[PDB]
Curated annotation (Swiss-Prot):
Other noteworthy facts: JQ1, a thieno-triazolo-1,4-diazepine derivative, and I-BET, a benzodiazepine derivative, have been tested on tumors with success. Treatment with GSK1210151A (I-BET151, a I-BET derivative) has strong effets on mixed lineage leukemia and promotes myeloid differentiation and leukemia stem-cell depletion.
Cross-link (Glycyl lysine isopeptide (Lys-Gly) (interchain with G-Cter in SUMO2)): 58
Subcellular location: Nucleus; Chromosome
Lineage of the species this protein comes from: Eukaryota, Metazoa, Chordata, Craniata, Vertebrata
Entry remark concerning the domains of this protein: The NET domain mediates interaction with a number of chromatin proteins involved in transcription regulation (NSD3, JMJD6, CHD4, GLTSCR1 and ATAD5).
Function: Chromatin reader protein that recognizes and binds acetylated histones and plays a key role in transmission of epigenetic memory across cell divisions and transcription regulation. Remains associated with acetylated chromatin throughout the entire cell cycle and provides epigenetic memory for postmitotic G1 gene transcription by preserving acetylated chromatin status and maintaining high-order chromatin structure. During interphase, plays a key role in regulating the transcription of signal-inducible genes by associating with the P-TEFb complex and recruiting it to promoters.
Domain of life: Eukaryota
Tissues expressing this chain: Ubiquitously expressed.
UniProt disease link: Cornelia de Lange syndrome 6: A form of Cornelia de Lange syndrome, a clinically heterogeneous developmental disorder associated with malformations affecting multiple systems. It is characterized by facial dysmorphisms, abnormal hands and feet, growth delay, cognitive retardation, hirsutism, gastroesophageal dysfunction and cardiac, ophthalmologic and genitourinary anomalies. CDLS6 inheritance is autosomal dominant. A chromosomal aberration involving BRD4 is found in a rare, aggressive, and lethal carcinoma arising in midline organs of young people. Translocation t(15;19)(q14;p13) with NUTM1 which produces a BRD4-NUTM1 fusion protein.
Family: Belongs to the BET family.
Name the record gives this protein: Bromodomain-containing protein 4
Originating organism: Homo sapiens (Human)
PTM info: Phosphorylation by CK2 disrupt the intramolecular binding between the bromo domain 2 and the NPS region and promotes binding between the NPS and the BID regions, leading to activate the protein and promote binding to acetylated histones. In absence of phosphorylation, BRD4 does not localize to p53/TP53 target gene promoters, phosphorylation promoting recruitment to p53/TP53 target promoters.
Length: 127
């Protein structure tokens, strides 16, 4: 099987806005997670071909990853901060769905998720 196309990251027909929460999600949340020692599996769409995971996209029907999230932020694709938060949550839950408790890849995701939740708890109030 080939890989699916990646999630959309730009749509010139969508309206765009700047908000302090979206700025924070890029400047603080995405950039901090990106540097984490276990970030690398989550920095781009899961390449099921290269990883030899022929059933990945039979099980995961709503793919998400931090490369896509980053591009969405940088393209002003999100109108609401909640959309971006949902995408991070989709990324983590996809890993937990595909895999099993205690797998190394799951514990990697859990470490990123703990950091994510700390940074989301520090999300600024809307201006
Ligand atoms: C050797 N083994 C390691 C785990 C890997 C694997 C899984 O078993 C299950 C997964 O859900 C993922 C994933 O989401 C991302 C990456 C990944 C992606 C890019 C670079 C490195 C890695 Cl580890 O790998 C995954 C695959 O079985 C090959």
């Amino acid at each position: 099987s080939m890989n699916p196309p990646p999630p959309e990251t730009s749509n010139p027909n969508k309206p765009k806005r700047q908000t302090n929460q979206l700025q924070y999600l890029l400047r603080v949340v995405l950039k901090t997670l990106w540097k984490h020692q276990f970030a690398w599996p989550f920095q781009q769409p899961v390449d099921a071909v290269k990883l030899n995971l022929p059933d990945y996209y039979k099980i995961i029907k709503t793919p998400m990853d931090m490369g896509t999230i980053k591009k969405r932020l940088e393209n002003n694709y999100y109108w609401n901060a909640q959309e971006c938060i949902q995408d991070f949550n989709t990324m983590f839950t996809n890993c937990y769905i595909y895999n099993k408790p205690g797998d190394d890849i799951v514990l990697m995701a859990e470490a990123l998720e703990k950091l994510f939740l700390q940074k989301i708890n520090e999300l600024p109030t809307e201006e």
